[PDB]
Amino acid sequence: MRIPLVGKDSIESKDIGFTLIHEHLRGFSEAVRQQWPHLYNEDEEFRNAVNEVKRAMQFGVKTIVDPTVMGLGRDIRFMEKVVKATGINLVAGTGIYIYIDLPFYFLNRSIDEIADLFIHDIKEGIQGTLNKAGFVKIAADEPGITKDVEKVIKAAAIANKETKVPIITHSNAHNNTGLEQQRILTEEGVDPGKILIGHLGDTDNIDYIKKIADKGSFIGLDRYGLDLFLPVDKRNETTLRLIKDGYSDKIMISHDYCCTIDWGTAKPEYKPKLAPRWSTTLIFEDTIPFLKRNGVNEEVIATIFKENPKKFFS
Amino acid sequence: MRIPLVGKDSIESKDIGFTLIHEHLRGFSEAVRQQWPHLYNEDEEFRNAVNEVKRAMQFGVKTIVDPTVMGLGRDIRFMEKVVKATGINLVAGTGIYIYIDLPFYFLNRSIDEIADLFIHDIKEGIQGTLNKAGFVKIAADEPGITKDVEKVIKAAAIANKETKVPIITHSNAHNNTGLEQQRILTEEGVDPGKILIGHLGDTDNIDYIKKIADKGSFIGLDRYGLDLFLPVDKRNETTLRLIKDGYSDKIMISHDYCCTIDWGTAKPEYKPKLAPRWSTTLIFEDTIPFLKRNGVNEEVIATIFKENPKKFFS
Ligand SMILES: [Co+2]
Ligand SMILES: [Co+2]
Ligand SMILES: [Fe+3]
Ligand SMILES: [Fe+3]
């Protein structure tokens, strides 16, 4: 009974089944939602999340891993409601999503104190419930590895060493942050196979992606549908190249779809080809059909969506 | 009926009486409190806030202005409970407290959209209640006037122009941020007399303080008891010098006391003289007795604590 599930008994990692490793039922900025609730509609967010999860389940998804944590509006009670309405296996996490500095709370606080928060969520439960965290989520982006970003990385390592839960990262695919996260974590004693370096699908720089995979970590081809980062076709070409080059056992695929997100995200670009529908099921409509008619067999699909998550959580 | 009060009918500004212009019933980081509620005890925070307010009232305080806004954990329902328990006049505000960047919500959003949030709080009410905001709070600190800090400044100007509520600032007394806030606001058409430039009591640089006062704005000698910024005696000397130099009609005094604050704030320094008790009443124990036995008459006290707030909110 290794993996805790929101609203359910824990499961053995071998029973995780077909998994989407990086999806968000909902995201928001905690301070904005607290201060201006008039901007939000929880009933709509709930409806949208339930509908997305149901669609994923209709394609055979058994488990969704949701790396919404501090900074993205994690809400374990909202999550448990979606579980009750759908029956999905849902893995919640702990961690901190920042790009530059920690909240003012953390002034004069140690890396140990930060890790203690993560361990609290893993061992005791999230937000005053008995729903426990099954992984740690950390981030770095365009600002790089700042002092406070590094603190969070080292705290995640402590949590992994104490509880053995894996680590999912957010990185910027064009500035070495993913490579740096992997290096810092492994220097702290984290098993490379317990790390998913996120958002590498945002680049077609295959040498960079392979470098991280070759160092032992999973590679997150995890933003299918977000053309602003990289178009689906380019992603598909990169995914296919990696598969034919033998990297199936390191590849993890997801959409990073946010059923609701409060970010402005408002600047449209129209290409010759119709824009694909970003959702939690685009890979079933586009990517997986594309791979199969390019000779990718069922065993590859099982490796990516079943065996790799199983290993990650083992 | 100019000034809205939490949990009460609005009052005419002439009836504000003896006012503490900058105190916090409670402060916290919204994201930390949402994610790790185990760190907090609302019952203790409530008890502490009620006790502080009652002590202030025993010294004749009629009105407390609380500039807790987004980023500091504003909670209008907590505030209204404290009002019900004490009978204080409490002025709540709107605004955004940041030093560098806005929350991710604000990506791709306009200054107008930001101002709309402030105007919502002023005209419609705070956090889904009919308690309206009576001023706007903005901040800048060691990072200076960043792009996002400037956005918030300009949004506050829009809110002031539309609703006539005054503006309270947080500044860093040693890096010209206060002067910059004043200049940017006045360039946008804000009356200088509708601005309180905060935290100027943190410096003994009297020329800098006078420069801001001379440009028409109130000067915040507003952190009595926070010796880490400037010891009470040095503050008292600066306050006295300003009074004897004729700046009573620009001076505003407060403690910036946070009945509870979640910041680490953990690094003690011990001086030869016993550390004064930082609270919402230290000025009644130390500062005001000090001024009086230095020849400062009752009319000065009335100017600072009654006439100046009256003007500010008129
Ligand atoms: Co991410
Ligand atoms: Co301040
Ligand atoms: Fe994500
Ligand atoms: Fe303050």
Swiss-Prot record, chains A, B:
Temperature dependence as stated in the record: Thermostable.
Residues annotated with N6-carboxylysine modification: 137
One MF term in the entry's GO annotations: aryldialkylphosphatase activity
Key word Hydrolase present: yes
Cofactor note (record): Binds 1 Co(2+) ion per subunit.
Top-level taxon: Archaea
Binding site for Fe cation: 22, 24, 137, 256
Catalyses which reaction(s): An aryl dialkyl phosphate + H2O = dialkyl phosphate + an aryl alcohol
Enzyme's top EC category: hydrolase
Residues reported in the UniProt entry to bind Co(2+): 137, 170, 199
GO aspect biological process, one term: catabolic process
Regulation: Inactivated by EDTA and o-phenanthroline.
InterPro entries, per the entry: AryldialkylPase_Zn-BS, Metal_Hydrolase, Phosphotriesterase
PROSITE patterns registered for this protein in UniProt: PHOSPHOTRIESTERASE_1 (PS01322), PHOSPHOTRIESTERASE_2 (PS51347)
Gene3D superfamilies, per database record: Metal-dependent hydrolases (3.20.20.140)
UniProt-listed Enzyme Commission number(s): 3.1.8.1
Activity versus pH, per record: Optimum pH is 7.0-9.0.
Transmembrane segments: none
Cofactor(s) in the UniProt record: Co(2+); Fe cation
Keywords, alphabetical: Cobalt, Hydrolase, Iron, Metal-binding
The family this protein is said to belong to: Belongs to the metallo-dependent hydrolases superfamily. Phosphotriesterase family.
UniProt subunit comment: Homodimer.
Function: Has a low paraoxonase activity. Also active, but with a lower activity, against other organo-phosphorus insecticides such as Dursban, Coumaphos, pNP-butanoate or parathion.
Protein name: Aryldialkylphosphatase
Gene name as annotated: php
